[PDB]
């Protein structure tokens, strides 16, 4: 329609055409709602949004991810076998829609558990990396200490060298 | 509307949904400056599964001329006096989901020579 | 208001990370004006962490620094420039990710 | 690892969808599909058997990061103190080589 | 639905330092000319 | 100065371009009954 590849430079640059001291300063940290791109992308939010918002939760608050992921893997294979069973008996039965909906529900809980794991991994990475950094600094310090002794070894070699010449 | 040769119109959302009849449809849209809201091409947007509207009775129409499956899709604007009678008006070529108007031989040569002189 | 200023400046800086938009501005002659270089110098406030916290597309910041060298804006009017810079950007991105993945997988499969 | 796990979960479904599709659409196909599903299911299981229940991540995470900050500071001091004295060596020991060079050239 | 890997070293480079150490440097090597040394190191290299 | 590519560049808009309207938002069909009687031109370099 009428719009081009967006309106070109305007407003802030017009303001900017000044000298020495006249241009406006930077904007404050709007700690609320903004409009980057098209999404609102407002501040103050979590990393993995609870599955309770938008879908049912089939898992209790114990949530031992390792055990529940293993159960969910089993439920999915068993539910596939039941979907094959609906095909044996009545392809048109109402349950076919439910079984197709129930298997999808299971595939989504596995992704929510994977999302719990990603921060479990962010937290672990924040914890380590500085452990590798720690060891590398100590090793680099040991190398310098050893190099200096070897440089002092060279100093004593030079002392031996004066009698060596005499 | 100043110079139709110097205008380009696109829509990134339409670019993924693109191939053959899709091209005719995109051109058919409305907001494209080349497409007229008058003439006969507007009434094909109103008609459904039409298969021969340009012949028996006539008028300004837009028809695909040559097509390369991925990107290249050339469109031609015809004015029919009667069935089996075609008069070509202009050609609009779409490269990479970007519509341009095909430059004339003489007009393009002359303007570019004026830039060189 | 200052809110609209912040939002428009954030959108503009995030948009500057596009080589197509940079070539657009360079060809249209916006860089030659001495007002735009002062606007760019003012835009350096995004390097602060409190301001960088709101940047969704971080690839812009580094690019912004290049725009201050005064030789990056004299060039880049060419389309081959945008071609090459976007090529290297997408190449770094995709090759880093998929090459790490493929190297790990191939080494794990070959060592076995 | 986690991306591989997600892709494996998605594929576990791929072999279900594909299996049923094939069915609606001979014996070797069902055999290979069954083998495929069972193989990838066991792989998903053994991959899940990897990431652990886990613990700390704060209490121990915070304590460890604080200790690491302290030790980074002390290691920086040790490496520099060595470094001031390391660079000290080359500083006037190359001037001792220049004294020897000056005495040789003055001859 | 799949969620992907975190930036990790990338986010670290973003939040602490600003000089992006990722992608290619060939941008600067091919487009930006080098800055010349002052007398401090001109003559220093002279005496080395 | 850059790889295999047309060895020529111009002023600015060989042709100037434009764009459509905000697509996320738009109207509806509101229909009525009849009453009652291949390649890829992507930036990724080709082998």
């Amino acid at each position: 329609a009428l719009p081009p590849p967006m309106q070109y430079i305007k407003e802030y640059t017009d303001e900017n055409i000044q000298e020495g001291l006249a241009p406006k300063p930077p904007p404050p940290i709007k700690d609320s709602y903004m409009m980057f791109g098209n999404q609102f992308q407002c501040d103050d939010l979590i990393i993995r949004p609870l599955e309770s918002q938008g879908i049912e939760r089939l898992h209790p608050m114990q949530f031992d991810h390792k055990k529940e992921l293993r159960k969910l893997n089993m439920s999915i294979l068993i539910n596939f076998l039941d979907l094959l069973d609906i095909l044996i008996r009545s392809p048109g039965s109402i349950k076919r829609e439910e079984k197709l909906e129930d298997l999808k529900l299971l595939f989504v809980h596995v992704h929510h558990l994977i999302n719990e794991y990603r921060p479990h991994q962010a937290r672990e990475t924040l914890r380590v990396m500085m452990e590798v950094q720690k060891r590398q600094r100590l090793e680099t310090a040991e190398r310098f200490q050893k190099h200096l002794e070897r440089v002092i070894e060279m100093i004593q070699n030079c002392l031996a060298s004066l009698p060596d010449d005499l | 509307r100043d110079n139709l040769l110097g205008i380009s119109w696109v829509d990134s959302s339409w670019i993924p949904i693109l191939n053959s009849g899709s091209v005719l449809d995109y051109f058919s849209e409305r907001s494209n400056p080349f497409y007229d809201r008058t003439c006969n091409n507007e009434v094909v947007k109103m008609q459904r599964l039409t298969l021969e509207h340009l012949n028996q009775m006539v008028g300004i129409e837009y028809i695909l001329l040559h097509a390369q499956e991925p990107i290249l899709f050339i469109i031609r604007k015809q004015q029919r006096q009667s069935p089996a009678q075609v008069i070509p008006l202009a050609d609009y070529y779409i490269i990479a989901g970007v519509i341009y108007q095909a430059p004339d031989l003489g007009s393009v040569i002359n303007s570019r020579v004026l830039t060189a002189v | 208001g200052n809110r609209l200023r912040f939002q428009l400046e954030l959108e503009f800086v995030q948009c500057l990370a596009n080589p197509n938009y940079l070539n657009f501005l360079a060809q249209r002659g916006y860089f030659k004006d001495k007002a735009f270089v002062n606007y760019l110098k003012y835009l350096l406030y995004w390097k602060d962490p409190e301001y960088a916290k709101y940047l969704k597309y971080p690839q812009c910041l580094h690019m912004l620094e290049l725009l201050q060298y005064e030789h990056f804006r004299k060039e880049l009017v060419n389309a081959q420039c945008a071609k090459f810079i976007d090529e290297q950007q997408i190449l770094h991105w995709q090759h880093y990710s998929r090459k790490r993945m493929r190297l790990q997988q191939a080494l794990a499969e070959q060592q076995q | 690892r986690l991306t591989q796990l997600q892709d494996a979960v998605n594929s576990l479904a791929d072999q279900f969808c594909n299996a049923i599709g094939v069915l609606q659409q001979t014996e070797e196909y069902a055999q290979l599909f069954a083998a495929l599903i069972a193989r990838t299911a066991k792989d998903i299981d053994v991959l899940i058997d990897s990431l652990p229940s886990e613990e700390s991540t704060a209490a121990l995470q915070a304590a460890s990061l604080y200790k690491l900050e302290e030790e980074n500071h002390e290691a920086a001091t040790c490496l520099e103190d060595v470094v001031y004295r390391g660079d000290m060596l080359l500083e006037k020991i190359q001037s001792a080589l220049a004294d020897i060079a000056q005495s040789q050239l003055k001859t | 639905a799949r969620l992907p890997s975190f930036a990790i070293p990338y986010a670290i480079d973003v939040l602490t330092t600003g000089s992006y150490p990722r992608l290619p440097t060939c941008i600067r090597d091919k487009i930006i000319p080098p800055d010349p040394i002052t007398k401090i190191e001109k003559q220093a290299t002279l005496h080395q | 100065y850059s790889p295999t590519s047309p060895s020529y560049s111009p002023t600015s808009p060989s042709y100037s371009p434009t764009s459509p309207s905000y697509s996320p938002t738009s109207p509806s069909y509101s229909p009525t009954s009849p009453s009652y009687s291949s390649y890829s031109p992507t930036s990724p370099s080709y082998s």
Binding site: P3, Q7, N38 | - | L8, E11 | - | - | -
Partner: peptide, 30 residues
Amino acid sequence: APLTWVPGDPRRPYPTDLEMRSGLLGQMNN
């Protein structure tokens, strides 16, 4: 980087022209 990212893939590292057009700087200035 997307797992399925491919040469035809539209998603790109700059802010993307299409997002600039619908973006506030593109529309609010007009």
